């Protein structure tokens, strides 16, 4: 649980610089929704989740390379749903 | 105890500029943005600018003519708006205030009165 | 950007009655819109936040209603104190923006 539980850690690092970021990259743009703390990581979390609603995303340039360092460290990170392989158990 | 502290007034001469400022207290984070609203007599609050001191970011309001140039000083915990070549247009009483990056202006400064006069 | 209509410009009302300011969005934007009062020589004043949520400091005469493009700053009593410019001010999309004002007036 040490190999596969770390890697809660990274994702929860990613979801929250993410966040940060996101905003950072979005405010300025005319239009983008994703311009508060908050919701910028309710996205984060659905980004990488990939859920995928699509009740908000980024408009700006740097704010999709936000979100596809979010995907990648993401989607990889989501090594956590393989560390809950101990429902195997 | 208050939070923003703005000077009360500046005097300036058409063509002039002066750099306003507004120094905080309380509570500080990495998240906060510090806002400028301008304010004409009569008139209601129009936002200006803003700007992430722990970043040093800052993005104004494409509407209106730019005339300012936000920045910010970490250590004193003071920001700064710079107004260039003022005309009478650009008299009025200016807010600063702490938005903790969740959308609403929680606190607000007493505003300074900006005139613009020979 | 997002366009916030104030209308009435001014409201007239009688002492202890109920009160209410109209905000709309020139489109949908969920509840991220924030109200505000300013008295005369005041600065803003945060009185309710995300349309519903309360503020501490703030009487509990003040409350907030609505969703999407249609919102409502609710005062039960009103009362000279009460006598102000109130405006409301969203979040949902940037750049932040203004409501025009709405002058509140007590008859007595």
């Known amino acids: 649980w040490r190999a596969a539980g770390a890697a809660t850690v990274l994702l929860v690092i990613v979801l929250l610089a993410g966040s940060y970021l996101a905003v950072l990259a979005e405010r300025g743009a005319p239009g983008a929704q994703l311009i508060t703390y908050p919701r910028a990581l309710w996205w984060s979390v659905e980004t990488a989740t990939t859920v995928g609603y699509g009740d908000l995303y980024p408009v700006t340039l740097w704010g999709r390379c936000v979100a596809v360092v979010v995907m990648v460290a993401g989607i990889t990170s989501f090594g956590l749903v393989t560390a809950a392989l101990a429902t195997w158990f | 105890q208050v939070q923003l502290q703005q000077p009360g007034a500046e005097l300036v001469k058409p063509g002039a500029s002066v750099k306003l400022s507004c120094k905080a207290s309380?509570?500080?984070?990495?998240?906060?943005?510090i806002h400028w609203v301008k304010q004409r007599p009569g008139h209601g609050l129009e936002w200006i600018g803003e700007?992430?001191?722990?970043?040093?970011?800052?993005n104004y309001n494409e509407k209106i003519q730019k005339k300012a140039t936000l920045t910010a000083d970490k250590s004193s915990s003071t920001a700064f708006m710079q107004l260039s070549s003022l005309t009478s247009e650009d008299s009025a009483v200016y807010y600063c205030?702490?938005?903790?990056?969740?959308?609403?202006?929680?606190?607000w400064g007493a505003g300074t009165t900006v005139t613009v006069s020979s | 950007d997002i366009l916030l209509t104030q209308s009435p410009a001014i409201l007239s009302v009688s002492p202890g009655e109920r009160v209410s300011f109209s905000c709309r969005a020139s489109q949908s934007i969920g509840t991220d819109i924030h109200w505000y009062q300013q008295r005369t020589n005041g600065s803003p004043r945060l009185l309710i936040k995300y349309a519903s949520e309360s503020i501490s400091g703030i009487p509990s005469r003040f409350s907030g209603s609505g969703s999407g493009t249609d919102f409502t700053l609710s005062i039960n009593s009103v009362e000279s104190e009460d006598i102000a410019n109130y405006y409301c001010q969203q979040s949902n999309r940037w750049p932040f923006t203004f409501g025009s004002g709405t002058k509140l007036e007590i008859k007595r």
């Open positions: 205030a702490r938005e903790r990056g969740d959308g609403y202006f929680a606190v």
């Open positions: 700007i992430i001191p722990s970043y040093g970011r800052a």
């Open positions: 309380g509570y500080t984070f990495t998240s906060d943005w």
